[PDB]
């Protein structure tokens, strides 16, 4: 959020309207989540032995 | 190339601030003015 506010700041001192930037961010956020969805791996197509592992792998990650 | 390249690039990006504040005092879309001023300066050279 902060870097996004920083990236806005530099563009404001350039002379751009904030709402059009904020709008310009959200349509640019909708293109980021879209690529993530189309590219994210899936644990639904898994057997039972490999689903309990991917859940450990995430547990590992977060820890 | 390498490290001392990014510096120069952001130095060239800085000098562009004079035309920006010149245009923004005039109430113009400073971005529209400069993008077109750099484009015309990539051909017609030192007068735009
Ligand atoms: Mg974490």
UniProtKB/Swiss-Prot annotation, chain A:
<comment type="function">
    <text>Molecular chaperone; assists the folding of proteins upon ATP hydrolysis. Known to play a role, in vitro, in the folding of actin and tubulin. In yeast may play a role in mitotic spindle formation.</text>
</comment>
<comment type="similarity">
    <text>Belongs to the TCP-1 chaperonin family.</text>
</comment>
<protein>
    <recommendedName>
        <fullName>T-complex protein 1 subunit epsilon</fullName>
    </recommendedName>
</protein>
<comment type="subunit">
    <text>Heterooligomeric complex of about 850 to 900 kDa that forms two stacked rings, 12 to 16 nm in diameter.</text>
</comment>
UniProtKB/Swiss-Prot annotation, chain B:
<comment type="subunit">
    <text>Heterooligomeric complex of about 850 to 900 kDa that forms two stacked rings, 12 to 16 nm in diameter.</text>
</comment>
<protein>
    <recommendedName>
        <fullName>T-complex protein 1 subunit delta</fullName>
    </recommendedName>
</protein>
<comment type="similarity">
    <text>Belongs to the TCP-1 chaperonin family.</text>
</comment>
<comment type="function">
    <text>Molecular chaperone; assists the folding of proteins upon ATP hydrolysis. Known to play a role, in vitro, in the folding of actin and tubulin. In yeast may play a role in mitotic spindle formation.</text>
</comment>
